Amino acid sequence: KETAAAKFERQHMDSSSSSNYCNQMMKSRNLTKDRCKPVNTFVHESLADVQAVCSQKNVACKNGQTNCYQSYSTMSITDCRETGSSKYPNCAYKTTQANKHIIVACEGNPYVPVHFDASV
Template sequence: MGLEKSLLLFSLLVLVLGWVQPSLGRKPSVQDFKRQHMDPGSPPNSRPTYCNQMMKRRGMTKGSCKRVNTFLHESWAKVQAICSQRQMTCKTSSKKNCHKSSSPLHITECRLKGSSKYPKCDYTTTNSQKHIIIACEGNPLVPVHYDASV
């Protein structure tokens, strides 16, 4: 009977870890990058509510307000091509897998307003054209982390 209980507990442990573990210490993914940063069908505009709507729609106001996020208004092919451009050390970490765009891209920067508190996340919307720095991983290299704009 003791062996059966042990096997049952071990099976349950494997099941639980298989379900929970992917979210713990998970590596950044292409899907996360696309959800958080890509908005190719939407040209930059001056709607002040753009960030409030997009941050909520893309799930970045669940549980807390994400402080800063940047949306890219370019095609996926153009953003992915940055992974083959100039490699550099990332600005937000010491990793060396970042790449800087060779030309400015259309972006929208969303910043949480100082007085804003969860659950009422309120953002400023700023449209511009800037060079971006992204981290790329895999083979072939694909964007997995938005590092900075310059």
């Protein structure tokens, strides 16, 4: 069974962005199977760099939990936002590139990212 950590990597990591990026990625990562996931974020930094955020700036999670961490330096990311003309099973997304600090919730042993909380 896929672990929470593995699920984070599948849903948010892309270390390897055109206007077609989100449409391709959201689909290839199985994020448009049960429904068109409203929004999603892909991080282009290395796994090691993203994992290192778990030992960085401790901040409150949006849900009120306390296991969230913010990156000390900005990170290359891509926001994927579902368009209005988008209709399942044909999910359409707006690909926006940016360089912002990321906030992820970490858990487990080893303590690794399990949820992407926000980009600031």
